[PDB]
Design a protein around this ligand. Sequence first.
Ligand SMILES: Nc1ncnc2c1ncn2[C@@H]1O[C@H](COP(=O)(O)OP(=O)(O)O)[C@@H](O)[C@H]1O
Ligand SMILES: Nc1ncnc2c1ncn2[C@@H]1O[C@H](COP(=O)(O)OP(=O)(O)O)[C@@H](O)[C@H]1O
Ligand SMILES: Nc1ncnc2c1ncn2[C@@H]1O[C@H](COP(=O)(O)OP(=O)(O)O)[C@@H](O)[C@H]1O
Ligand SMILES: [Mg+2]
Ligand SMILES: [Mg+2]
Ligand SMILES: [Mg+2]
Lengths: 412, 413, 412, 405
Amino acid sequence: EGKIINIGGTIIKARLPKARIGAFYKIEPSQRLAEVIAIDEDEVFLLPFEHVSGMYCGQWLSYQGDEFKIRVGDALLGRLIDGIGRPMESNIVAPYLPFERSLYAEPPDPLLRQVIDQPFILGVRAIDGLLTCGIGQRIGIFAGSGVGKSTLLGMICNGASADIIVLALIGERGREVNEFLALLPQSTLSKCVLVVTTSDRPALERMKAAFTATTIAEYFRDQGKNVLLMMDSVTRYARAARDVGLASGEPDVRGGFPPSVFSSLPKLLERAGPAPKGSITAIYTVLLESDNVNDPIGDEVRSILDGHIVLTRELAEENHFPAIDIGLSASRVMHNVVTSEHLRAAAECKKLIATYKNVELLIRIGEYTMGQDPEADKAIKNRKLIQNFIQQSTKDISSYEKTIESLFKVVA
Amino acid sequence: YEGKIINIGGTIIKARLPKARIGAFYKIEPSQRLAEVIAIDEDEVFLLPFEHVSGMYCGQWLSYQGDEFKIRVGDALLGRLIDGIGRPMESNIVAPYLPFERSLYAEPPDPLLRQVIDQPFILGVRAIDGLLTCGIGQRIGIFAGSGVGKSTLLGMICNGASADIIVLALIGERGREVNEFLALLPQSTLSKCVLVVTTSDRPALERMKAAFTATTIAEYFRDQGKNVLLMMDSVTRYARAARDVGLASGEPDVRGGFPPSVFSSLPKLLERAGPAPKGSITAIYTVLLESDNVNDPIGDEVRSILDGHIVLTRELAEENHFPAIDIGLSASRVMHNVVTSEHLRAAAECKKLIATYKNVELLIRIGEYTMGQDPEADKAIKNRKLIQNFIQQSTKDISSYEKTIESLFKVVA
Amino acid sequence: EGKIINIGGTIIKARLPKARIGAFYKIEPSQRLAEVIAIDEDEVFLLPFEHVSGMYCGQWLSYQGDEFKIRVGDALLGRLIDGIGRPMESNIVAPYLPFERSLYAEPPDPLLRQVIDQPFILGVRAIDGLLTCGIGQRIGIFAGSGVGKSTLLGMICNGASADIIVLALIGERGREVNEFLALLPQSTLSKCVLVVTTSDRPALERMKAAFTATTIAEYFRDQGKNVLLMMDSVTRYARAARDVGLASGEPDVRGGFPPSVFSSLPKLLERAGPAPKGSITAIYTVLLESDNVNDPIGDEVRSILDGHIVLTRELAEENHFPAIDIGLSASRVMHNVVTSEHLRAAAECKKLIATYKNVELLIRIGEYTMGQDPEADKAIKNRKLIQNFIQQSTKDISSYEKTIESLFKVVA
Amino acid sequence: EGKIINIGGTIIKARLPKARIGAFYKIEPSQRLAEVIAIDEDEVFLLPFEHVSGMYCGQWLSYQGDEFKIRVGDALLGRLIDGIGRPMESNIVAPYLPFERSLYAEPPDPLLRQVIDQPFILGVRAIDGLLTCGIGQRIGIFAGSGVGKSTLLGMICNGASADIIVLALIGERGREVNEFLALLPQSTLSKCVLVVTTSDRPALERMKAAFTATTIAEYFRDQGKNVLLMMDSVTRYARAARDVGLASGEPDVRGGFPPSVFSSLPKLLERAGPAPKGSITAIYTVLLPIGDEVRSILDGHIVLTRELAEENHFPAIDIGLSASRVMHNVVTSEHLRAAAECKKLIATYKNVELLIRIGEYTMGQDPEADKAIKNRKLIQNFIQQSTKDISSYEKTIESLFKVVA
Ligand SMILES: Nc1ncnc2c1ncn2[C@@H]1O[C@H](COP(=O)(O)OP(=O)(O)O)[C@@H](O)[C@H]1O
Ligand SMILES: Nc1ncnc2c1ncn2[C@@H]1O[C@H](COP(=O)(O)OP(=O)(O)O)[C@@H](O)[C@H]1O
Ligand SMILES: Nc1ncnc2c1ncn2[C@@H]1O[C@H](COP(=O)(O)OP(=O)(O)O)[C@@H](O)[C@H]1O
Ligand SMILES: [Mg+2]
Ligand SMILES: [Mg+2]
Ligand SMILES: [Mg+2]
């Protein structure tokens, strides 16, 4: 037991002699749980699973657990789970999950990871013709606010070729859990797990949803089947962890973020990828703070992740959707996957896009003798062909062969 | 009786009173004024008074009133003005019989019961119905600088739109304006409208809780099963009041001022107004920006919370392009569901025509544009004065939803 | 009765047990004053009315009242007032004032404001034809340093006919008291109260002088008079409040300023407007920290007041006086005041000003051929008529009728 | 023995006297270990390597010594190793490691720099014909992303004139270590000792991997051997030491980096040069606020541009703006002038390509460009070879001699 002596907005400070970090306590009069996040030799910083309704001084605590585990198993497809691990829907009968796992595992050994050599057919024509994703790659989608990170996941998840899909909705609107279900048919809903926590929810449900989704992805990986994982705004995880750690006596470092965010983010983000048996392939939506690249939580996620898709709102103004900026974006694993003519044609049309992005100024001003600079002469004649290759509709999914045949047409 | 105020100054008082709940409020015993407990330490607690802090002294006794501040709603407050605390503003009246006492803080609907919105909510403005398009159940925001177009466009929307109940929250704004909003809305609209008025002179608490009062009244008239239009002018006044309360209570400073309480308590308010099992709330929140940059702390946060954003630019108000909404920089996140394919395709073509002229505009002014060497630049010029009569609109004009479609089809050709 | 325990440079603090906040005290041996602003269980922060040089630890504080109230009356007309209510001019007898008023009163109730619909002529043609002032409108004049703020208030001191002129000169040059007494005739000076504190005076006396001007204007409003209040550089009040609020231990929320200067600027600017009995029409001069309009106090006072008249340095260097930028200027009540043909004539004139600033570099370099655009030729032919309608010398005043007839002549 | 007072996220505070700065402490039951950054009078601010969850008030600290030193031997060759010297896998038992030495040593002063000779044949025809390095020349490769740096480093681990080949992989990705170890043969992998540490690994050992690699390579320097020392992405060492310095508490100076990384990085890489008892040739990579700081601190920098790898020209090297400061000390004047006329033979081809485009291309005089356009094929077969075309030093110079002809 122990006494509660301090009630802030986010965190609780209590008196517990020799309490363990992670060891969760429930509150005796009112059934609500809390998890210890710091020690101050008698003053323990606990973090409650819920809201702070009435929290008087000297309210008691009681010991419940050594660390917080979730309950997983095969009887989990087609369900909706919150960040804690509880079933969110109440229309369905209560499941049977045989196994329990801790949320903090350790990544696979880097000597035993495989080599990515088979493409991940994705659906979008730019992210298959120009930036091919491999099965086992961890790509990321960097954009501002309302630039189209959520649509692009709809375009991917609609036409995705995975054996099993784990979709995490961290810290985001509850208006849209039904809109991700509205574009998932039952053929790709009978094998999908949605782990959803809303921005209404408290700080550590919103902080631990990423770990719950990664633990579930690791379970269906350790059965032996490759699995897609999609986190929507891992920046909502990073800002939940910032709010948790910063209100516990831990200083600012670079953007308001404590050291523990930069210490706990490359352990979440690294336990995907290849494995001795199976492979998680993951897609991390990252919400940039402003429209800059001097962002302390978008720059390191660009640094420790192979493949960054930079969406630009300076292309979303011209109604160019999806707003993929091919100049600022790259995929590290397309020189290990696709054929040599595919690499050559993709680099050819990236040259054509980059040449048209500075030749048209001397088109509008009348200084253009067609014939002297050959590359620009092929970058304007193939303008509308490239533009109808790059931007596509939300409901237009296309197989990998059609993307590469239109690629060979638009280069030739 | 119970505790003693030991610290007076700024926005919050601090008192020594033990076994205090959080959120419970307390009457200052010789003074009839009362205060909410916002943060608890071992024996000293942070309180937030409802009124001015002047006149207080150390050891002033602090009696107990209740465990939670609740407001009092009923059906008998249509056509009537409400304060931020919950009291009625006007004193000419006989006070209503408001029977149902609702708590101020409540929970959003279940995310699995909020259905997909697919019915257009007709406002009346041609740009925001033709190019962008609202839906019955979304929550849209109007982002602008200081004195650009927010309250003029919200008056146009309140003039043109129709709903069963209209809750209009004039929080944090000048007192001159409560008569202009009562002037430009008709008698039939005043038969179904509740104003929640908090002027900018009022304390941090009234200016902080008037938004939750308006959202609670909209939830009450939603639970009866009516399509209620919520309109909240300057939700950033809530954000500034939560800032100085949370900083006075001793919190850090992330994203330019603004404690973690602000960014963690905006979604606990803005997620409460949408589709629902019974009824729906169509919320319209105006946002004031600390410069003309849209990428504010609060501007970017509220843009990443809401369902659609209408960004108004000062550089279009310098040219009398009213309403000053910037079509390339604004967007509506539900118009692909609420309208057919011809309108969506024609709106896409018109938005691209506007962006094409914005690229062509500067090198016409300094005089270096050449006609003929680009087919779609000239198409963005040959139509331009035709599209502007669709994109800019007088204040005393409402436009039907079928005239908007036929004007857009004539513009786009 | 209590003793001072430190002196900080701006504020002092003392050991007063159980003191009221807002109450003021005499520093007992040496005859000065201070007032309580914050309490720390026996240690009160005090803001002295004078300079702090000479004090020492253990210096007593006798009690004098619970609130610093000024002595107001009807015999203030025609005489000059120190920043805290005292008379200045020692050449004549002390006036007799009957009543006491505190400096902190409430605004009129918002249901009793009676939306403003009568014009208030100023004498300047740009703030008659193209902007228009209502009786009860509070207006701001936003500019940089030495751009023409005081010159324009001197223009509209002898042009605006109001019943009582209460002019405040807070935080400005001591040299100017005579110059604003050399622009007012005796038919104006017999009804003009002139409250003035200069840049020398202590931080309390520059903080608490705008409240003195508003309290005198409210005493003359409650008799039924149409008061014209006008303040010089209200940002001098904002900077005095910044200095005291940072000395008293408040954070730095935006651009240098505490939150208490942002929360106490509306409850000074909201008292001057339309009322049930009488009215105060006010004109606040605002100095900006650069020539940017997006200063923090510039932005906040723009979001409080009912109209902003932006003077730019560029037009002053162009010798375009008065330097009003018509694009950045707005009057929030012009449409409730002027007639509709006046309104559309004003909108057409502002359209012509913007169209000339579009086509000016096109005609100067030599690409504009006479006849292409059917509005730019209107603007070019009416340029000089617009320009000598906009410009005005200091000693020229225009009426309302001649201004609108010249507006109709110039715009068509 | 030393109890732990409290835990602050990443900074532990213990109550123990007679501590040292840099004294690696040790959890006694859990066999986790922690390192000291600052002391109070009686308390000590220290920070751990491993995880934090599980630590309560009163855990004991084995003091375990005074500074952490790695067990170095001749039996490290062909064996994986972590960033603090411990072995990677338990698949092979650890061999005999009879000698120990600290990570920190005193360098000679920069005023006593030496002349350099004994040309360092390194494998790729471009620099080993044109930018020819020596035994003491430490080289900094500047290469962005999508440019093929790993294949270049792997093909210059092959055919390098090094008896011992120490390579440090620092902070990188768990797939890239296998993708790099695949393209090294057993003829090389029986000769390397190679430090790997991934981004999951803590920042403290992700900066001690640099000192571990330099310490092992300087022990193998002392046995009368020449040794090559690679370090991929010095910028990852910079961000690791930045996290260690800012978690310890330091005001940033330029960008977000503390001054302690600018204290350590010269002290990291102006040591390990041409020692007379056997020497150590360094190859450091830096991706494209510290880039000028690196190319002004070591001699002879290679740049790689992915614009040059837009074509199928691997290695993605540009000769026109990559330099090697010490060739005149190393190679003769004849080969130096031949390589110089080749550099200015290539460097006028893009100075003549832009006038191929507009219709004014004339003859009559193109004295650096007319011989280039006719003899371009031997150029682009000379500075363009495969992934496993290791060229001898005697045939690179002859091939360059009929390239200049
Ligand atoms: N591929 C697309 N096609 C059409 N519209 C798009 C596309 N991508 C984004 N948009 C527009 O941008 C708006 C917001 O994008 P969203 O995905 O909601 O942003 P975020 O994921 O960053 O919250 C949507 O209303 C949508 O109409
Ligand atoms: N659609 C419009 N038609 C006419 N005038 C407008 C329009 N929009 C803005 N304005 C002018 O700009 C001024 C400021 O707009 P306002 O709505 O008061 O800004 P705020 O957003 O701060 O409330 C108004 O007085 C108005 O006359
Ligand atoms: N209408 C005008 N005619 C002539 N000079 C002017 C006019 N308006 C401004 N100026 C110039 O600007 C100077 C300083 O302006 P002032 O009003 O004193 O600046 P501030 O805004 O700093 O008080 C005037 O003395 C004059 O030189
Ligand atoms: Mg989203
Ligand atoms: Mg407004
Ligand atoms: Mg002045």
